Design a protein around this ligand. Structure first.
Ligand SMILES: O=C(Cc1nn[nH]n1)N/N=C/c1ccc(Br)cc1
Ligand SMILES: O=C(Cc1nn[nH]n1)N/N=C/c1ccc(Br)cc1
Ligand SMILES: [Cl-]
Ligand code: NA
Ligand code: NI
Ligand SMILES: [Zn+2]
Length: 331
């Protein structure tokens, strides 16, 4: 059995191997990559996402989100306070201001220590979930706006057409901006490209151990857990690596740099933070192996999560017994 310790694997596809996206995902899984929950893919040297990033300052961040924490340094929740719109150029200047800029640090490990020590005492502002793409239309390999759709995957595997569309999102980050512990909607895969700027550090729990993280989260956030049997779906809970280690939770960590892709696998819980000003693009996707995870994925029906139009058909077809309750939670 490949990758039995569930380590994060790093791949260096050649230009030929970079042509067929689905085939390379399958290849990584044949090597056990999915057991970690996350893999890094370094594109071949001949590849580029677009020519330059010199002309992005006029993109609008319609609803920047200030991420306000509550709790303790290693066990906290965050809520998103809406701020006034600003352009990417204005956001970059804000990220680099004294209030928000990355502090002096010696290496990624020093910055990680500073993050977990000090995150709760600041409220960084995040450009998240902006529909759009920065891939050039002429980039034919690993273009996140040109992947096969999840709707087409479900039709190919299970035989029925469904409504819905699947498009990418942009994320503009700054120091301390945080993504809470979660799996993807319907336990889908995700792919993430860091277009420009400073790194993003990731933490991940192997899919085979995801229930261990859920159990700890219920213990550490007891009111939240009483409110919703799938409250991690709300994407607001943070637990530090120190607390995970103290509780024996299996996990790994890795830092992504500009020009690198990360793939998260079905039911791989992940969380992390941005080191400084950056821009990432991400989208969910499916493969034949996802179907069984989609059929079993937990759902939030308490109201909080209230997700995409496209999730309706996935619940409707893959989880008919749960559909009516889930739908009540969306309205
Ligand atoms: O601004 C910072 C460091 C920072 N200090 N505090 N927060 N971040 N790096 N920017 C990098 C960058 C790369 C490519 C393009 Br295009 C535009 C900007
Ligand atoms: O969860 C993530 C990464 C992410 N970065 N900022 N928000 N989420 N990808 N899937
Ligand atoms: Cl700090
Ligand atoms: Na490990
Ligand atoms: Ni995610
Ligand atoms: Zn809920």
């Amino acid at each position: 059995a490949q990758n039995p310790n569930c380590n994060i694997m790093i791949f260096h596809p050649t230009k030929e191997e970079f042509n067929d996206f689905d085939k390379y995902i399958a290849y990584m899984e044949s090597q056990g990559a999915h057991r970690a929950g996350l893999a890094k893919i370094i594109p071949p040297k001949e590849w580029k996402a677009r020519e330059t990033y010199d002309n992005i300052s006029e993109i609008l961040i319609a609803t920047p989100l200030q991420q306000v924490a509550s709790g303790r340094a290693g066990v906290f929740t965050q809520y998103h306070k809406k701020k006034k719109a600003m352009t990417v150029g204005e956001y970059r200047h804000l990220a680099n201001s004294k209030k928000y800029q990355t502090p002096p640090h010696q290496n990624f490990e020093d910055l990680e220590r500073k993050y977990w020590k000090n995150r709760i005492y600041n409220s960084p502002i995040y450009g998240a979930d902006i529909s759009g793409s920065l891939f050039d239309e002429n980039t034919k390999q690993w273009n996140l706006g040109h992947l096969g759709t999840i709707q087409d995957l479900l039709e190919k595997e299970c035989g029925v057409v469904i409504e819905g569309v699947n498009t990418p999102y942009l994320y503009f980050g700054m120091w301390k901006t945080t993504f809470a512990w979660h799996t993807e909607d319907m336990d889908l895969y995700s792919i993430n490209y860091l277009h420009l700027g400073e790194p993003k550090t990731w933490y991940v729990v192997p899919p085979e151990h995801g229930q261990r993280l859920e159990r700890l989260a219920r213990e550490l956030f007891p009111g939240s857990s009483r409110g919703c049997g799938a409250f991690l779906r709300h994407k607001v809970a943070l637990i530090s690596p120190t607390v995970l280690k103290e509780n024996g939770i299996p996990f790994n960590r890795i830092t992504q740099e500009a020009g690198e892709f990360m793939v998260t696998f079905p039911y791989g819980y992940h969380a992390g933070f941005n080191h400084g000003f950056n821009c990432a693009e991400a989208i969910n996707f499916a493969t034949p192996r996802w179907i069984d995870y989609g059929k079993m994925a937990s759902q939030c029906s308490c109201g909080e999560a209230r997700v995409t139009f496209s999730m309706d058909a996935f619940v409707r077809i893959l989880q008919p017994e749960r559909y009516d309750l889930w739908k009540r939670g969306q309205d």
